[PDB]
C-alpha cells in the first residue's frame, strides 16, 4: 500500500489484518462504474505488517523514456563526385526527416501516451568500412547539419547550403560520436503521438501525419574529398528524451507498424493472443 508512512520504517506494503465478520464488503464492486476500487490483500486474507523498500523510481516516465535509442540508420560514402548527376541517389550526402517512430521499440514506449513534451538529446555515431580493395583507412570527418523547415535543402555534397551561417551543424570524426541537445521544438504545447485530423478540410489530404510532431531534419555528408578507394560511412542517430512530460495513457499496440505517423497494421497478420495448448481450464 501507499496510505500510511511510518517513522521507524517508512511506507508499509501491507498492514496487519485479522478476521472479518462484517456487513461492509470491500471486494464486491461494480466495474460498470468505470472505476477500479483500490482493494488491498488485507481486505481478503489475513496479512502481516510488511514494508515497501521501494520508491517506484525506474517506472518514472522521465526514466522510462529517458535512455538513448537508435532512431535512424543512414549511409553516406566518400567517393569521386565527378560525373555524378544526383548526389543524393549516389549517397554522397543523405538527409533524414527527424522522427522517433521508425524504430518500433522506442515508438511503442512513446505511443503509450497521446501527448509528450521533452527536450531532445541526440548522439550521432559514424562508423566507416571499405568493402572494396583499399591501401589505408581514411581519416574522415562527418558534417551533420540540422536543417529546419523552410531552409534551403542541399543538392550536392559541395553545395552552398553546407556553410550553415544560421543552421546549426556539428563536425566530428568517423569512429567518434557527436552529442548535442535540442529543446522542445513543437509548435503546440506537446508533441502529438496520435492525430485524429487533417491539415485542412480536403477530400484528398493525408490523415494522421502532421507537423505537430515535427522535430526538424538533419542532413549528413563527409567533408573530406575523395581518395583512390570508396569508403562507406554508416551513421546511426541516437535519441534520449529528457525533462519528459506525458499525457493520456493509451492502450499498448500489439500489431506491427507499417508506416510513420500512421496507425496502420498489415493485412493477414498473425494472431497476437497466444492460443492455449489445451482448453480454458488448463494451467
Amino acid at each position: 500500500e501507499e496510505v500510511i508512512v511510518e517513522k521507524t520504517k517508512q511506507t508499509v506494503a501491507s498492514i496487519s489484518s485479522g478476521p472479518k465478520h462484517t456487513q461492509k464488503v470491500p471486494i464486491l464492486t461494480a466495474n460498470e462504474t468505470g472505476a477500479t476500487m483500490p482493494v488491498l490483500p488485507s481486505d481478503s486474507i489475513e496479512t502481516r505488517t510488511t514494508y515497501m523498500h521501494f520508491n517506484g523510481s525506474e517506472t518514472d516516465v522521465e526514466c522510462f523514456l529517458g535512455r538513448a535509442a537508435c532512431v535512424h540508420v543512414t549511409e553516406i560514402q566518400n567517393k569521386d563526385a565527378t560525373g555524378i548527376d544526383n548526389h543524393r541517389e549516389a549517397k554522397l550526402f543523405n538527409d533524414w526527416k527527424i522522427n522517433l517512430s521508425s524504430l518500433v521499440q522506442l515508438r511503442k514506449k512513446l505511443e503509450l501516451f497521446t501527448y509528450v513534451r521533452f527536450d531532445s538529446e541526440y548522439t550521432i555515431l559514424a562508423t566507416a568500412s571499405q568493402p572494396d580493395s583499399a591501401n589505408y583507412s581514411s581519416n574522415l570527418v562527418v558534417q551533420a547539419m540540422y536543417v529546419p523547415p523552410g531552409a534551403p535543402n542541399p543538392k550536392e555534397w559541395d553545395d552552398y547550403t553546407w556553410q550553415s551561417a544560421s543552421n546549426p551543424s556539428v563536425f566530428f570524426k568517423v569512429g567518434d560520436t557527436s552529442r548535442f541537445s535540442v529543446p522542445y521544438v513543437g509548435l503546440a504545447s506537446a508533441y502529438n503521438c496520435f492525430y485524429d485530423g487533417y491539415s485542412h478540410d480536403d477530400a484528398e489530404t493525408q490523415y494522421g501525419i502532421t507537423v505537430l510532431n515535427h522535430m526538424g531534419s538533419m542532413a549528413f555528408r563527409i567533408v573530406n574529398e575523395h581518395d583512390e578507394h570508396k569508403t562507406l560511412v554508416k551513421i546511426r542517430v541516437y535519441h534520449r528524451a529528457k525533462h519528459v512530460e506525458a499525457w493520456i495513457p493509451r492502450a499498448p499496440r500489439a500489431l506491427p507498424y507499417t508506416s510513420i505517423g500512421r496507425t496502420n497494421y498489415p493485412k493477414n497478420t498473425e494472431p497476437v493472443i497466444k492460443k492455449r495448448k489445451g482448453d480454458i481450464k488448463s494451467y
Partner: protein, 47 residues
Amino acid sequence: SNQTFTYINYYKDAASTSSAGQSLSMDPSKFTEPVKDLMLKGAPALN
C-alpha cells in the same frame, strides 16, 4: 546516504541540462477512480 555534487550547470540553456528526476507526485486516482460521486471501499457501489 550521500548526496551527489554534480549540480553545476555548464551551459546557458535549460535544454542543455540533465534529466529532471523523479516527480514523487504519484496520483493514480484520475485513471483508477474517474467518477463523479466518491465511492468508498466496503460500501455498496450502487444505491
